[model samples]
Target: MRILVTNDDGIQSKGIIVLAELLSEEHEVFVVAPDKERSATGHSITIHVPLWMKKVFISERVVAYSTTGTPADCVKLAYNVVMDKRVDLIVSGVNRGPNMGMDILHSGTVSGAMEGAMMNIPSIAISSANYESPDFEGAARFLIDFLKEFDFSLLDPFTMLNINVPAGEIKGWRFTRQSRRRWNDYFEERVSPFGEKYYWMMGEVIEDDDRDDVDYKAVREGYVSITPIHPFLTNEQCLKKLREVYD
Candidate 1:
């Protein structure tokens, strides 16, 4: 399979390198990632600024490049300009931190995979739950095994997956729903020595206990959480009520 691999953690991140190298052992891999960290870039595309790409040398089996754009841009450029043929799958991370709950909305790691799904490709975004010290090898090994056994044909083109693995010991894998959990107020105001006011963004995660079947809980219990995400933003229930009101 020709796999297009990308990530928000940048081209030199250990996580993406491990993933591309491991996947390259069996599948043909092409990696196009940002030259620097684009962590919370979401699904933004570069239109105003010129996108730049440079070819990078990795292994013989894997071809890589660095792009001066967002994570979504890497996917867009790879498919539209880099690859000669169609990509079989897109694997977008082994990200530095877990992209569970509401984090997906702002995560460039997940956005990279989201762009693939938007383009009608089978896509996956994988992350390590730990931010301090991630287990890239474990995540890579699990994905390699999972990709070999799981049937990609079972997934529809519009469907993409967000997977978060525990940093430590192996627990089981579980299909999960996105948690409604969000971050609380995080801006810290301070005055500098020059009497200039500035703010630093910092926040703590607020968990939702109403459902245990969410990604955060699964990861907390040391399980690999897999959530299926789609590009559609329509609210079917709201559409019915809205139609009646308008009609």
Candidate 2:
């Protein structure tokens, strides 16, 4: 299958590079990614600004481009401009940080692959559950190996796989659901040299889910977690069995 590889971690990162390498060995691969970091941008598209993409650099395995675009922009532009033929699949990340639970909502890594899913292609967003220093080789191989047995027929076009692997070692693999992870968030006010003020966000996860089948727990338990995602949201059960509330 013809595949496109992308990440929110930028075009130069080792994660994407190694992923492209391994993917290209068996399938045609293309790389269209941001020129710099674009994590947590969600699925934001560049409509107001002049979106820029150009053939930049490659390590001689696959066709590559560096973009002044969001992660979703990379996938979209890659579809319309970069690949000459059909894109059968998309692989995003091996992201530097965990795209665990609610974090995936803000994740450009998820959005990049999610855009492909939106476009009716089977896609995957894979990550190592580590920040900055990730196990790229292991993570990449885990994805490649998973792909070998994954039945694409089971994945609906509107759904994709969000896979996360532990950083240390492989325990096993589990098909899981997203955990409801909340954050205790705040920001530290700071001053620039010119006396300007800004705030850098700081937060810690206050995990709420306990089911061992949740994605977050699966990773923490040393397992590779795979969550099939259908990208639409509504709190359907929020008012469940609460008909008695008259307020």
Candidate 3:
């Protein structure tokens, strides 16, 4: 099968490189990624700047490209410019960080997959919970096994798999939904060395344990969080009420 592999953590990231090497054995893989880290750049396209992609290097079979743009731009250019023909599948990231809880809202990793799902492709976003996860082979194995049972055509066109592997060995799988958790703290003001003011973005993860079937709880209990996320963010219940009022 032909697979298009991309990541938000740039072409040089360890996670992406490892994933490329591992998956190359099974599928025809191509690497199109940001030239530098574009971690939290959710679905942002390069409109103000001229985007460019150049082949960094090529082995006997694998081809890699580094683009001066966001994750969405890399996928956009791959479909429109680079690939010779139609792509079969899109696998986005064995990301260095987790895109769990509310992180998906600001995740370039998830957004990268969302881009392909928009085009009616079977897309998946895979991430490791720990930024420095050393055990990624298990996650790869899980994906291979899971996809064997998955019916690609059975899935909704708007849905994409958001897989999160927690630190260490996984216990099992949980079909979950995105947890209703948001970062309470974002930026803190501090004084710079030159007597200037600066702000540092920092926050602790607020988990949702009370909710029975949230993605966070699944990961916390040593399960791989397999959440089927959709491109639609609309609140259908609220929309129904609003429609009644308007009518």
Candidate 4:
């Protein structure tokens, strides 16, 4: 398959670089990503600023490019401008940290894959649960196996699979739902040396007792968490009540 390899972690990221090399062994791969760490960029597209790119050398089977755009722009731009053929798959990670709950809303890694899904391609976003000393090999290899087995035809055009793998041993894989999110954050009130007041945001997810079938708990329990994401922002139940109010 002609796979578009992309990431929010940037073109030079250890995860993207290494994953591209390994995927090249089995399939044709293309790397088009942000030139630097774009991390929590979400699904933003650069319109005001002109996007540019340069070809990069990864491997004989892998063709790569670094773009001056967001991760979503990388997928959109590369598909229209760079790729000569129709891409079959898009793999958007091996990200440095897990993108779960609220993190997915702000994550460039998830957004890159989300863009692919928006474009009617079967896409995947993967991440490591551990931020420090992450071993990406196991996660990369797991996807390679997933690439071989999972039926891409099962997904609709607007569907994307978000995956999170633990850093250590893997017990197995589980299909999970997106977990509920809440942040336990506080702003640190500080006066700078220049005599200005600034508040630095600091926080972590306030983990609640989620079900085993949720993404948050599955990965924490050493299982690879796979969550299917379908982007529909409207609440059907609320719409019914809203109609009655209008009447």
| Predicted model with the maximum TM-score | 1
| Predicted candidate 3 versus true structure: per-residue lDDT over 127-237, tens digit per residue | 987776545666666777776787788778778889898778788888898887667678989998999999999887676457788887888788989888888878999
What's the TM for model 4?
A: 0.94
lDDT of 3 at 151: 77
Q: What are the Cα lDDT values of the candidates? A: 0.91, 0.89, 0.82, 0.88
Model 2 residue 46 CA deviation in Å? 0.6
lDDT at 220 for candidate 1?
91
Query: Alpha-carbon error at 192 in model 3, in Å?
Result: 2.8
lDDT of 3: 0.82
> Best to worst by lDDT, what's the order?
1, 2, 4, 3
Q: How well does candidate 4 match the true structure, expressed as C-alpha RMSD?
A: 1.6
Each candidate's TM vs. the true structure?
A: 0.95, 0.93, 0.93, 0.94
How far does residue 151 in candidate 4 sit from its true spot (Å)?
Answer: 0.8
The model with the greatest lDDT is 1
**Candidate 1 vs candidate 2, TM-score winner:** 1
For each of the candidates, give the backbone clash count: 0, 0, 0, 0
Model 1: per-residue Cα lDDT over 59-155, one tens digit each = 7889999999999999999998888748998999999888988789999999999999898798999999999989999999999988878887877
lDDT of 2 by residue, 13-88 (tens): 8889999999999998999999998988988889998888889677687999989999999999899999864799
How much lDDT does candidate 1 score?
A: 0.91
TM-score, cand. 2 vs. native: 0.93
lDDT of model 2 at residue 23? Answer: 90
**Which stretches of candidate 1 lie above 4 Å from their native place?**
243-246
